[PDB]
Structure formats: C-alpha cells, structure tokens
Design a protein that fits this description.
The protein is mostly beta strands. It has 3 helices and 15 strands. Strand 4 and strand 5 form a beta hairpin. Bound molecules: ligand WWX and zinc ion. The site of zinc ion has 4 residues, from strand 7. The PDB classes it as lyase/lyase inhibitor. Keywords: drug design, carbonic anhydrase, benzenesulfonamide, metal-binding, LYASE-LYASE INHIBITOR complex. It forms a monomeric assembly.
Length: 258
C-alpha cells in the first residue's frame, strides 16, 4: 500500500498509478517570472459555516477534517472557477524538518507545511467521487504555513491528535473556524493539476494563496506523532507526507495580482 516511506513513496507510485507520470500532475514549483497576471481572474468568494465540520480522522496519510456536503452552506466561488464548489475536507502536508514541508514551492523556497481545502463541483456532478474524475470537478485551495505565532484553529486540531494516533481512528470535530486559517490577503496563483496523492486524478483546479499563515514549531511537531499504521501493527510514524514538485509540461500558472 502506498505511502511516503522508502519502498512505497512518491518515486514508486507510478508502479501502481501510471497517471503519476501524466501531463497535469501536482504539486509544482511556482516560478514567478513565468507567472502570467490575468485580469479575467475573479477574486475568491468564500463562505465556510463552522458547524459544517463533522469529524477528524487519521487516514494514515494525513489528518482529514470532513464536512457535511449536502447543502451550499460552505462553498468556494469566483477565482478561476465556473459555478459553485462545495467544501468536502481539509488536510495538511509537512516534512521531517521545519523548513522543508510544503508541496508547492515558490522560486526555490519551501514553506514549513501546506494546508489543503478540497472542494467539488456540485453544480455539475452528483458527488465528490464523480467530480474527482472530471477535469473541472475539484478545486483545492492551498495555504502555506511558516513557523510563527500559534493559530488557535490549528491548536483545535493538534489537541485531537492523541485521540487519532493510529490509522483509521476518528473523533467528533465541529465548530471549526476554517476561515481563520486563511491569511488576510487572498491574492493567489492558479493552474490546472491533480490530486497529490494516489489516485493522482487530473481533476483539480489549484488555487495557491501567496501569503502564509503561522504555526508554531510545537504545533507542527505534533503532526509527525501520527502513525501511518493501524492499531496493533508495528508502529511507523508519519514524519513527512509531501510529494515533490512535478514537471510543469508547459502549463500556465496565472496570478490574480500584479
Ligand atoms: N493533496 S490532495 O488535495 O490532492 C488530497 C490529499 F493529500 C489527501 F491526503 C486526501 S486524504 O483523504 O486526506 C487521504 C488519502 O486519500 C485527499 N482526499 C480524497 C479521499 C478521501 C478519503 C478516501 C479516499 C480519498 C481523495 O483522496 C479522493 C476522493 C475521491 C476519489 C479519489 C480520491 C486529497 F484530495
Ligand atoms: Zn493535499
């Protein structure tokens, strides 16, 4: 089964998921000299209902906070998007060191970690599973994290981690103020790409926010204490879960700002 260890990590994924070498894979290096400003891009419009959050689980690959997705209470519109994209879940990527944990990189620079907020096109498709197999199906908001003052919604997450240490565990999680994990500037970059985990489907419109938010070193370290293994298996720790940047293959990265 896939993971981030030496014999099941990113370089091996193509052995089971051939789309790993596809032409629209993520993450990428954003090269600001090649980024094109586009005045047709719209500002992001976001609304996340804190009571939309239901549970947090350990997938063995990250934590996932899952949201009720039967209504348009928590939705993302505008940006590069056509129509309404319904919030499905949030999760985080990090690395074994505090200065090299993000998925996307900007002009050579890695951030400490990278938060992804996953949405699906509910104006066109009947569920997230269906949306995940279409080019305009999903939209993921990426927010970088840098070492700084602790965020209280990140503490709300890290307080749960002891209860979800083993893969498959979950616990109630609601009244989650997700909008608190967005930076005050919503300037962004956007490009067409993929899930960064197997099955690596090329269905994602990426929207990567330029400004980072802050996490403490203590908060960040608590994520590395999650296991990628299940209860009563030999313990292995999720000390890193970021995929390297993938070939751009000519894709256009657009900026909302200049
Ligand atoms: N970095 S990314 O934004 O591209 C990303 C991740 F990094 C990520 F860790 C997940 S995950 O849900 O946290 C565990 C691996 O599936 C999903 N979520 C979906 C999922 C949830 C539960 C079980 C399987 C899959 C996603 O993996 C998915 C959903 C439906 C169809 C294909 C894939 C995801 F989209
Ligand atoms: Zn992700």
């Amino acid at each position: 089964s896939w993971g981030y260890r030496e014999h099941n990590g990113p370089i091996h994924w193509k052995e089971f998921f051939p789309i790993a070498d596809g032409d629209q894979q993520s993450p990428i290096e954003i090269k600001t000299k090649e980024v094109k400003y586009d005045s047709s891009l719209r500002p992001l419009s976001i609304k996340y209902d804190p009571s939309s959050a239901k549970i947090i689980s350990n997938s063995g690959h990250s934590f996932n906070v899952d949201f009720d997705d039967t209504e348009n209470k928590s939705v993302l519109r505008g940006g590069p998007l056509t129509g309404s994209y319904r919030l499905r879940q949030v999760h985080l990527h990090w690395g074994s060191a505090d200065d090299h944990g993000s998925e996307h990189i900007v002009d050579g620079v890695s951030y400490a970690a990278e938060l992804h907020v996953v949405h699906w096109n509910s104006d066109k498709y009947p569920s997230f599973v269906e949306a995940a197999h279409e080019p305009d199906g999903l939209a993921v908001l990426g927010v970088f994290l840098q070492i700084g003052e602790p965020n209280s919604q990140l503490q709300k997450i890290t307080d749960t981690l002891d209860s979800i240490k083993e893969k498959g565990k979950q616990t109630r999680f609601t009244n989650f103020d997700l909008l608190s994990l967005l930076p005050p500037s919503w300037d962004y970059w956007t490009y067409p790409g993929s899930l960064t985990v197997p099955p690596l489907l090329e269905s994602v419109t990426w929207i990567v926010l330029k400004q980072p938010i802050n996490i403490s070193s203590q908060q960040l370290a608590k994520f590395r204490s999650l296991l990628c293994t299940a209860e009563g298996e030999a313990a292995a720790f999720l000390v890193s879960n970021h995929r390297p940047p993938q070939p751009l293959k000519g894709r256009k990265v657009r900026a909302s700002f200049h």
